[PDB]
Write an enzyme that holds these catalytic residues in place. Sequence first.
Site, PDB file in Angstrom:
ATOM      1  N   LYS A  15      48.704  48.942  34.947  1.00 14.05           N
ATOM      2  CA  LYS A  15      49.236  49.031  36.301  1.00 14.05           C
ATOM      3  C   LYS A  15      50.198  47.866  36.506  1.00 14.05           C
ATOM      4  O   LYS A  15      49.799  46.758  36.866  1.00 14.05           O
ATOM      5  CB  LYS A  15      48.103  49.014  37.316  1.00 14.05           C
ATOM      6  CG  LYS A  15      48.472  49.495  38.708  1.00 14.05           C
ATOM      7  CD  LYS A  15      47.252  49.542  39.616  1.00 14.05           C
ATOM      8  CE  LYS A  15      46.161  50.425  39.034  1.00 14.05           C
ATOM      9  NZ  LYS A  15      45.033  50.631  39.975  1.00 14.05           N
ATOM     10  N   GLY A  74      45.706  44.249  39.362  1.00 20.11           N
ATOM     11  CA  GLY A  74      47.090  44.528  39.059  1.00 20.11           C
ATOM     12  C   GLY A  74      47.720  43.335  38.375  1.00 20.11           C
ATOM     13  O   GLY A  74      47.344  42.192  38.619  1.00 20.11           O
ATOM     14  N   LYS A 114      47.223  46.556  43.898  1.00 24.12           N
ATOM     15  CA  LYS A 114      45.816  46.692  43.545  1.00 24.12           C
ATOM     16  C   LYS A 114      45.211  45.355  43.125  1.00 24.12           C
ATOM     17  O   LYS A 114      45.936  44.417  42.812  1.00 24.12           O
ATOM     18  CB  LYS A 114      45.645  47.714  42.428  1.00 24.12           C
ATOM     19  CG  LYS A 114      44.361  48.531  42.520  1.00 24.12           C
ATOM     20  CD  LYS A 114      44.339  49.404  43.763  1.00 24.12           C
ATOM     21  CE  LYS A 114      43.018  50.145  43.891  1.00 24.12           C
ATOM     22  NZ  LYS A 114      42.958  51.001  45.107  1.00 24.12           N
ATOM     23  N   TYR A 115      43.877  45.287  43.129  1.00 22.05           N
ATOM     24  CA  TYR A 115      43.171  44.043  42.837  1.00 22.05           C
ATOM     25  C   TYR A 115      43.331  43.652  41.384  1.00 22.05           C
ATOM     26  O   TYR A 115      43.622  42.496  41.072  1.00 22.05           O
ATOM     27  CB  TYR A 115      41.695  44.197  43.183  1.00 22.05           C
ATOM     28  CG  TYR A 115      40.775  43.069  42.748  1.00 22.05           C
ATOM     29  CD1 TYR A 115      40.616  41.939  43.527  1.00 22.05           C
ATOM     30  CD2 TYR A 115      40.016  43.168  41.590  1.00 22.05           C
ATOM     31  CE1 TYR A 115      39.756  40.929  43.146  1.00 22.05           C
ATOM     32  CE2 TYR A 115      39.158  42.151  41.207  1.00 22.05           C
ATOM     33  CZ  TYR A 115      39.036  41.039  41.994  1.00 22.05           C
ATOM     34  OH  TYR A 115      38.190  40.026  41.629  1.00 22.05           O
TER      35      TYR A 115
END
EC number: 3.6.4.-
Lengths: 147, 244, 490
Positions: C130, C4, C1-2
Amino acid sequence: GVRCSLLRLQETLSAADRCGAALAGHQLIRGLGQECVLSSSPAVLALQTSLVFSRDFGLLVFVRKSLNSIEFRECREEILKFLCIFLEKMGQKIAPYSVEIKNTCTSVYTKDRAAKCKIPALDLLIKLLQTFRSSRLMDEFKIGELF
Amino acid sequence: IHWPCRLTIGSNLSIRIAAYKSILQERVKKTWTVVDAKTLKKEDIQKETVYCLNDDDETEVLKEDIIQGFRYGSDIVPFSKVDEEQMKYKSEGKCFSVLGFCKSSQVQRRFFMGNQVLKVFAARDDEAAAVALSSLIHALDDLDMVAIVRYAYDKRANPQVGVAFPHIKHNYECLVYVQLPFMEDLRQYMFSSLKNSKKYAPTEAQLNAVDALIDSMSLAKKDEKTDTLEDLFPTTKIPNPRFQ
Amino acid sequence: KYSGRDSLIFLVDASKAMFESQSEDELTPFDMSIQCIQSVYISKIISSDRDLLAVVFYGTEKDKNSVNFKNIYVLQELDNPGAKRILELDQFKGQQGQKRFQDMMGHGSDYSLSEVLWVCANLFSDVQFKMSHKRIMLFTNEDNPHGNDSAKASRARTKAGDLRDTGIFLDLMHLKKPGGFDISLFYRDIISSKLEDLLRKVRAKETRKRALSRLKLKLNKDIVISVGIYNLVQKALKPPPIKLYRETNEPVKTKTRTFNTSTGGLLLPSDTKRSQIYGSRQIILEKEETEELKRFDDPGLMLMGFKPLVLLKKHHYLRPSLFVYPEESLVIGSSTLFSALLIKCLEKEVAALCRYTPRRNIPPYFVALVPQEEELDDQKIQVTPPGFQLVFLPFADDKRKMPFTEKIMATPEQVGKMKAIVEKLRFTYRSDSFENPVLQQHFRNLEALALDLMEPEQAVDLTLPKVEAMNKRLGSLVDEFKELVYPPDY
DNA sequence: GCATGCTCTACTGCTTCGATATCG
DNA sequence: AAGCAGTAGAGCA
DNA sequence: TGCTCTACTGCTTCGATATCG
DNA sequence: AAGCAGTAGAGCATGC
């Protein structure tokens, strides 16, 4: 029920590791908003209009003591959302208990940064100047600065 | 403006050199002066700013208080400027020096990365240095050999690496300087492949539709009986529409 | 994910002979591990300053852990790289640090088993975020640490399997107890030496990924395709200079106003207009008027012809070059039209010509779209992604005029000498490593304030010529190339 | 008879932050 | 905001 | 009038400031 | 752009 939760909020302030303090603040304010509203008698209501306002342990003091922080928004903002409906769940048993409310909302508006903490705390002051279109107190709110 | 500098190779190949600019971004020079209405004079504006540390009920301070703090890791670190003006990088003078060479032309188009291009021309005034430079580019002509050249304008500008392309033309034999990236200014990132992609492969009638679109929308074809190229719509000769 | 973040736990084996000098007066592995950990922190505190970095010593005499085991001492918790964490941690350098660690926690005990991996799992489980990378850096030198009890070996490989299940991977950075890699032992059951990455190679980098614009290319009027316009060479520079109050050590929070209209007072956006002077007469306008006089088109790309790759000279460039890719917010099939257009434009070596308006109100600009086919290899040398590339093109007052009327011919007695010279200087280019002197010494100079060790640290710059090693390498043909045909002769 | 109570998802906006034009 | 090399105003002879 | 300190001056480089997706 | 969060408001079931 109340003032026991207020000293539970005071020990929520004065504790350590300020994330459990955030959970305790959010759940204690949104539990206080429930334990206040199950009233229908004049007795505890007449008690609460002075119970929510004190100098040594209080909601004003709690807002201003946790105001120099980038951490606590979803609790103090819930208090400020709840006082706008304190002004309507009760009528005018707040009549001298409002100039410090004006300075409380002006402080929390001009010191905090997020917009979601400046929309309910400017719904409140407009609601207050709406409901107190009566005789006194318009000289007692300092308009010549508030303008 | 005539640029005098001096090119070096090794110990002593001190060629007195002239540099000039070439294609660059064009900017409009006039600025929008903010005036006040209903007066038609300028002097009715005196802008201020206050460096107001409120964080509370408002406290408005004078200038003489300001330390230029930087950010580090999770905090703010002090020490504003004369100390950084001392312990900055000493730039030791301008340079048009030569670092190395490469016979393999492996500076390709997608890495050029500057906002100007610099025609480094020749010497003037007893041009033994210029005939030496034309000998240098007349040695660089015969094979695809590139030249990595380190530049500085002055003491102020950060030093930079760049490529010196040769330019063999009719009435002028020049070299052109372009910039180059330092190894902070790249980044590589994985993108998915489109040849061996089992989902998005087209059809041949689609391909010929593309080819008909190309050969009906082509702008460059050879004609005039000697089969040199003539181009429709040369997108270089347009005047600038913005200042117009 | 961006958004993350990644995570790293430093598990230090300071137990039996690692705290000894190995009876060797050459290097000490405890100070080597603490130097490597300090290098990792001191790079990633400006390289990638948002990951999670923890330090845990095991085999110690005391214990500190939230399940309350023995011999296991966590020191810090999963958080940012911090100046407090490194100024706390560097008290264990050298023999003075060996004695200070001895008196502070002690050394030597019957160390753990599976339980330390249990502590790592209970250290990762708490974090509510995350986690994208789960790695454990083990600093150990023994390679049969339970070579007398097989029940602890079976339980340790079982618990390492259950740490591999949930997605935790360890890479033990091997210390040098035999120096050379002669321990060809059987430690294959747990794993998925060389230290130079942890040592040197990354003193000034960053990590990021965005898209910078998502525009649409229209061919005729109705055939639209959606492309993300990525940027791949970006010119990083030094961060903004935060302002700070002197005494209370806090930001200043400036504010700005406008008054003194020959009366004083205070103003608003509406009372004032924009203006210009041209010699004698003055113009006045509104802010919307001066923002609307540069108004042409709508954001996107407009197809305006085709051309093969032979007219554009690489004498001609203006700005850096972006990179257009077939995104997925118009239709499932814009990728397919881009793939067909890619194949045809590459095989007939044709390049698109377009007009390009970047955002909501900018004048238009001519670009040329050049294709690019990917290159990978056996070992995945993914050096190019497949997609199209912008090149900008100048208009009118970009190209100036030189003096330019000079043309003198030289003599061909120099070309073989210069061919030998450039074959003497020949090096195969580069792939990386030409780092920035100004930003680099700024990094080191900022290290030398909050870490305040001695002075500005090392400041080598890999962009200087070495004339002393150039003279002997070239040889004594400098004089003959200087005066074979031409004397300056004053 | 419309007067009320109750429930899930697309339209609006928030916030960080990276880039870009622009001023000095 | 901060240098920078041609272009001259006038001291010096 | 012949030489030079110096008093500009257009002319460029950079550094900080809103603007915006 | 990248992600989150709210909620306004039109659509499910029972009321002087």
